[PDB]
Amino acid sequence: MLEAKFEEASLFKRIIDGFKDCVQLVNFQCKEDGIIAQAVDDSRVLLVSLEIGVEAFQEYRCDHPVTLGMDLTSLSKILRCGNNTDTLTLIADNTPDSIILLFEDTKKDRIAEYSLKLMDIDADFLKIEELQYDSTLSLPSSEFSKIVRDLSQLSDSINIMITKETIKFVADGDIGSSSVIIKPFVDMEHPETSIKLEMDQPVDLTFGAKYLLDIIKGSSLSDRVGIRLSSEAPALFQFDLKSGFLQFFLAPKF
């Protein structure tokens, strides 16, 4: 009925990581064009949205829509058992109470099979994404990961501000302060180091550093990170998949 085969289990593992620090109970809607998942934290400042396209799997077959409500902790326990390089195949016949996970390795000499029991998770799906954001911005995820990791040393809240040609991060907690200033540049070897900034309106927003910290563990899925900011809206942090993405919508501090 449903058969999704990841070329490498690391992918699913990493996706599930991006979620697990933010919530435990998540519905995975599987359909003909792939899988989506949406989940909010308890404070409802952070919404995590995932979409995994068909071409993102080595092989993918879903006969008809089916929801897989899962406990992220239980799931990650099971994922602990396979390794980053195993092929992972999720499988379910329709109207399921549980799914199956298949790791193989091609030496040789491995083929482990587990079965997770599904739960019923009550979900009211949200479509809060805006048409355009005041500023759009991309950069190496590794770089953004450091800026966050660093600045979250001084303050429990980080302030991001965009003016013409300047992106600026600032943490100013009791103990001390730091300010990173970066700017748009293309660098051809390679251009995945480059920093892109499109600004309609300048924006000056502040976020809980604790959540930014969650958001940047998606760095493992993508060389780069996209960031859309608006004055009156949750910020959108995005890591592109081969086909799809993991996105984090995060409420600016009032």
Report the DSSP beta bridge partners of residue 203. Answer: 162
71, two tokens? 């406990």
Experimental technique used? Answer: X-ray
Alpha carbon dihedral 160, 164, 166, 172, in 10-degree steps, equals -30
Inter-helix orientation angle 9-20/72-79, to 10°: 150
Phi, psi values for residue 177, rounded to 5°: -145, 155
Tokens linked to 88: 């992972």
Q: Which of 13, 2, 178, 32 is nearest to 88 (CA)?
A: 13
Q: Cα separation of 119 and 117, whole Å?
A: 7
Distance linking the first and last C-alpha atoms of the chain = 47
In sign, the C-alpha dihedral spanning 208, 239, 165, 180 is positive
Q: How far apart are CA 169 and CA 161, in angstroms?
A: 7
Residues 86/13, Cβ–Cβ less than 8 Å: no
**Phi and psi of 202, rounded to 5°?**
-75, 150
If DSSP codes are grouped into helix, strand and coil, which group holds residue 182? strand
Q: Which of 7, 1, 3, 63 is nearest to 32 (CA)?
A: 63
CATH number of the domain within which 15 lies: 3.70.10.10
How many Å apart are CA 1 and CA 56, to the nearest integer?
Answer: 19
**Cα–Cα distance, 160 to 230 (Å, whole number):** 11
This structure's resolution (Å) is 2.9
Residue 12 CA to residue 16 CA, distance in Å, equals: 6
Closest CA to 28 of 92, 84, 106: 92
C-alpha distances (whole Å) from 31 to each of 34, 60, 94, 131, 242 are 5, 10, 12, 25, 18
**Please, what sign has the CA dihedral across residues 186, 191, 193, 199?**
positive
User: In terms of Cα–Cα distance, which of 125, 109, 22, 10 is closest to 72?
Assistant: 22
Amino acid type, 116: L
Q: Which two tokens stand for residue 159?
A: 């302030």
Alpha-carbon distances, residue 235 vs 22, 95, 107, 178 (angstroms): 16, 36, 44, 22
Q: Name the helix (H) or strand (E) containing 75.
A: helix 72-79
- Please, after which residues is the chain broken with C–N above 2.5 Å? none
Count of domains for the chain = 1
- Residues in contact with 66: Cβ distance below 8 Å, sequence separation at least 6, in sequence order: 1, 2, 29, 30, 92, 94, 95, 96
**CA distances for 210 relative to 158, 223, 233, angstroms:** 9, 22, 19
Which residue range is the domain that position 212 belongs to? Answer: 1-254
Which phi and psi (to 5°) does residue 215 adopt?
A: -55, -40
Cα separation of 46 and 61, whole Å? 31
